[PDB]
Design a protein around this ligand. Sequence first.
Ligand SMILES: Nc1ncnc2c1ncn2[C@@H]1O[C@H](COP(=O)(O)OP(=O)(O)O)[C@@H](O)[C@H]1O
Ligand SMILES: [Mg+2]
Length: 451
Amino acid sequence: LEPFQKNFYIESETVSSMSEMEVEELRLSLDNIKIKGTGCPKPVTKWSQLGLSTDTMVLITEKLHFGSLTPIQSQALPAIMSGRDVIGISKTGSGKTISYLLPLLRQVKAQRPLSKHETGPMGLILAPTRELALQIHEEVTKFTEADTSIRSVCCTGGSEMKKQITDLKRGTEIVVATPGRFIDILTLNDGKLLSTKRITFVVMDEADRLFDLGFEPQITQIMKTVRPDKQCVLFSATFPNKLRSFAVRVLHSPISITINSKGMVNENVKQKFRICHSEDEKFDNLVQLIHERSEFFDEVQSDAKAIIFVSSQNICDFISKKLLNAGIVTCAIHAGKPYQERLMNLEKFKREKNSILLCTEVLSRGLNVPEVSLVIIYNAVKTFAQYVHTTGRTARGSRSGTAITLLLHDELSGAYILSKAMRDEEIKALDPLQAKELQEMSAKFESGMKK
Ligand SMILES: Nc1ncnc2c1ncn2[C@@H]1O[C@H](COP(=O)(O)OP(=O)(O)O)[C@@H](O)[C@H]1O
Ligand SMILES: [Mg+2]
């Protein structure tokens, strides 16, 4: 019942100044960060936005040379440092260790040191295997080497547990342990060797594996004995129902952070693109797509509408007229038409069988049209939010249709977005060449950015 500080995070002015629209775009760009729970702070983008110690900043930026945070770090660090229970779900190799380690270190460092009668630890990291525990312990050691105030001990079934004990005799601030082994240590020396009294921070790492390998009973037993108001975090590559059930029971008002759990675009949407080398070739492709649609219609005839999004009023006027020369009728809408003429076009589009709407991307914001069978993005969009909003005009659950982007060969940010928004399955099903050109473009954008 001794009071302890859990909430340390002071949001930097740079992050505070970020608008909610900017945060949404940032979360999309960081491998589709999705949050559940209330009061999650904005994600950070620099190590310097976190109030880390000078020494930690040196290790991270000058010895490990980390230049950017992973998505799970960007969002999990501020949330955990704000004292919240957090569930973090992110693919293997995405930096989950540091995501919990830096906040653990901060909380532990802030507390009253162990008195001579206190065994520790203050922090507990549970891992499903000896090998994993040892790895975590290595990281903990690295980040605590320069600081005498924090010791770590790795408690596993590692050859000489006898070499683990003698160490525990001296006390420790952090224990990294497999769950069965931790419980065993709790009974040694009449329960006087290692105590849970001062545990304020618990981490469950590789938590799906903690459960698969049969540790739920041990972990339940551990949670029941740690103080109820502990901070607890759970990190894992997957989040099966049984683990969720455990998490919900055991965590207090947790924040859930998932990194690319589902597609930012509805999975039923068929995403496509065509790379063109000039506006002329782009228009030729548009006409061809429209012709292929019409052929399909006859074939089917043994109401599927389309929207073409363009960037500007001028391009809208221009394409409407060119399509008409090619014998293609459209309803066009852009801010240069009076309100009545826009309504007229909307109602015509809705009323007419297999109609085509030509619309500027900004008129699409407040667009009163039902979802459609086909979206053609004539001018490739350059943000994730625009791409999700535009392709979303064909998202209709199981009855979703097709979204096609006409991409110029120098539209590197457009390629980058496609490369991240399309499904892995879609990218894999691409013709080797298409996939090659897309990746090169994406790569070019990526390098061009940092450099
Ligand atoms: N921001 C970062 N930039 C570069 N490398 C990182 C970053 N964060 C972590 N790493 C490194 O990436 C590797 C995998 O990190 P880890 O925490 O083991 O991933 P996970 O736990 O998600 O599988 C490790 O070598 C780790 O030190
Ligand atoms: Mg890990």
